Amino acid sequence: SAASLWGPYKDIWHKVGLLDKILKKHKPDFISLFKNPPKNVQQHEKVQKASTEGVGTRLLPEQLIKEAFILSDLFDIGELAAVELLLAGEHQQLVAVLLYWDGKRCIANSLKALIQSRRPELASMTTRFTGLTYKVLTLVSQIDVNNEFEKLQRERGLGSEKHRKEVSDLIKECRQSLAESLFAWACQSPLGKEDTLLLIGH
Numbered sequence: 526s527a528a529s530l531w532g533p534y535k536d537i538w539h540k541v542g543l544l545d546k547i548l549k550k551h552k553p554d555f556i557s558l559f560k561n562p563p564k565n566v567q568q569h570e571k572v573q574k575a576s577t578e579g580v581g582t583r584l585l586p587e588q589l590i591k592e593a594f595i596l597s598d599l600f601d602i603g604e605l606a607a608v609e610l611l612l613a614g615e616h617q618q619l620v621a622v623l624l625y626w627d628g629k630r631c632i633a634n635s636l637k638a639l640i641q642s643r644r645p646e647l648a649s650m651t652t653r654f655t656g657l658t659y660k661v662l663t664l665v666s667q668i669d670v671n672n673e674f675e676k677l678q679r680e681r682g683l684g685s686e687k688h689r690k691e692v693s694d695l696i697k698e699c700r701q702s703l704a705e706s707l708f709a710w711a712c713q714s715p716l717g718k719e720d721t722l723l724l725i726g727h
Contacts, residue, residue, distance in 0.1 A: 530613035562603030640709035
């Protein structure tokens with residue numbers, strides 16, 4: 526499972542820039558994606574009960590439930606994960622949206638830092654499962670999905686530009702950081718002809 530908090534990611538990055546092997550060790554988070562949990566129906570009943578449990582459990586008031594549903598509908602995301610996100614970040618509104626993006630931003634930056642900066646046990650650790658390399662292409666996809674546009678179309682007659690500029694911004698940054706990771710991989714060459722062909726196609 527992946528910790529769905531921004532904080533461990535933020536602190537770890539701060540260590541670099543100290544690197545503690547322990548925190549870094551629970552590495553799989555640097556998947557860069559949220560492929561496994563998308564919005565789930567099964568999770569909605571769980572949340573609706575007002576009792577929610579993560580992979581302790583906590584009571585859920587109505588106000589929180591609304592923020593949580595806003596997240597899942599807004600970004601096709603699992604309802605419980607969405608809650609972990611609200612919990613981690615100070616509850617103010619929505620904050621949950623922030624943690625969602627900050628968590629991703631940090632992960633990407635760290636991967637970028639490692640792949641580019643170090644020349645190494647850790648880089649070997651990160652790449653070794655690869656796996657990051659499998660994921661890099663998918664990560665550029667996904668940012669691609671134009672759910673935002675669909676929302677925009679539905680919105681017409683009503684209009685929430687600002688919330689969108691905010692998301693479009695986080696994504697562009699993600700693409701940009703994604704660029705650095707790919708480049709870094711090339712400098713730290715992965716093996717053969719297949720990747721190039723795949724990328725050329727993508």
